[PDB]
Structure 1
Amino acid sequence: MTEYKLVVVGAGGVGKSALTIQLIQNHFVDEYDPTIEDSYRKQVVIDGETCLLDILDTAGQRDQYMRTGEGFLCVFAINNTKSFEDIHHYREQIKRVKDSEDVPMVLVGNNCDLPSRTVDTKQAQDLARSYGIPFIETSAKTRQGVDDAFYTLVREIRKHKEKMSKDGK
């Protein structure tokens, strides 16, 4: 099969671990145990391809994981304006470490079940459109969007691989 190295990045407390554990283990972690660094491997069928997902769940509050990752799940929380503002800085850091302008990424607005919203859907859709990447709203609590976020990132990596192979021709 093909292995895909995915890295979940973003500010503290936005739900990176809860999203990843929903994908891997199908349950919601209600408690908040700040991560040092956790890794998971999951075989899944995406678009009738058997792939191995190697997923790195990073600390919220770097260069090595940015070098290794093939695609980045850039998570903010819709109730945390700073976490949304942080995305630009994560993206610039990744571009710098990769020495490249084209890096597979998906923007994820988590906590979409909460009423305390300070980041509008349009703000985030507009940002993703500028970066040329998908935007998915998710809730690790209700599982809304979880599979879509990770599978979309695999699709972006596949597209990148084709754009690079055709770029070399």
Structure 2
Amino acid sequence: VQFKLVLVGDGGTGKTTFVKRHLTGEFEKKYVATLGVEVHPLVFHTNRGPIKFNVWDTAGLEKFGGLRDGYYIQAQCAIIMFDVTSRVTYKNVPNWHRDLVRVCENIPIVLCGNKVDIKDRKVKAKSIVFHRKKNLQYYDISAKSNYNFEKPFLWLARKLIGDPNLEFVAMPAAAPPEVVMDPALAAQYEHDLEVAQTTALPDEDDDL
């Protein structure tokens, strides 16, 4: 099954970072503002078979907005993102919600407060009530720590498939192929390994 998912919310809230973490496993530290939209397929393996989200990761900065609500057409679900370290991003949640539901009247929507890994939280738990009258699911998330990072998709999967017991399952693990070292690429690998060994791994003070 495939579902169009639109991701909306203020610039720099972590939309692209979140999706990239889900696509590749990487944590992009750099802020490169999305230009209009980036669309990526994202598959989860479930106890009811694979689910594919067509992720429309939209630009939150007004100057890079592109088609704006044009991106929302035939969305089947949505994430509204804000940053719990930036109060303005929560203040703008009703504006994103407004623009989204005008185009997508009856879709499951998750509100995500991102960056809960940051000690100095500015949007406190008690302030976050917008979801209640709007029937949005809410999660505190961190694209950085992976806190609840699967919850938005699990909840939307359960809503779209109409099965509240749907679980993410371990994607099957085919036997990997036996390796033939290519003698011609020998000197090639020595180089590449050299560069990799002398580039520092990031975040050497993290738990892993």
Q: State the Cα distance separating 1:13 from its structure 2 match.
A: 0.3
Q: 1:116 aligns with which of 116, 120, 127?
A: 120
Partner of 1:163: none
> Counterparts of 1:21-36 in structure 2 under 5 Å?
21-36=20-35
Q: 2:78 aligns with which of 60, 72, 75?
A: 72
Give the alignment's Cα RMSD to 1 decimal.
1.5
Partners of 2:96 and 2:23 in 1: CA distance: 24
Partners of 2:123 and 2:39 in 1: CA distance: 29
Partner of 1:106: 110
Q: State the Cα distance separating 1:137 from its structure 2 match.
A: 0.8
CA gap 1:156/1:84 in 2 versus in 1, 3 angstroms: farther
Q: Deviations over 1:113-142 (max 9, x none)?
A: 012211112322x22222112111111111
Higher Rg of the two aligned structures: 2
TM-score (norm 2): 0.70
Aligned positions, number: 155
Q: Indicate the SS of the match to 2:139.
A: strand
How many percent identity over aligned positions?
A: 25
Hey, which of these two has a bigger chunk of helix by percent?
1
Which structure has more relative contact order (CA 8 Å, sep 6+)? It is: 1
Hey, which of these two has a bigger chunk of strand by percent?
1
User: Which blocks of at least 5 consecutive residues in structure 2 are unaligned?
Assistant: 62-67, 163-208
Partners of 2:43 and 2:119 in 1: CA distance: 35
> Counterparts of 1:126-145 in structure 2 under 5 Å?
126-145=129-148
Q: State the Cα distance separating 1:154 from its structure 2 match.
A: 2.6
Partner of 2:50: 50
Specify the code of the residue in structure 2 equivalent to 1:95.
Answer: V
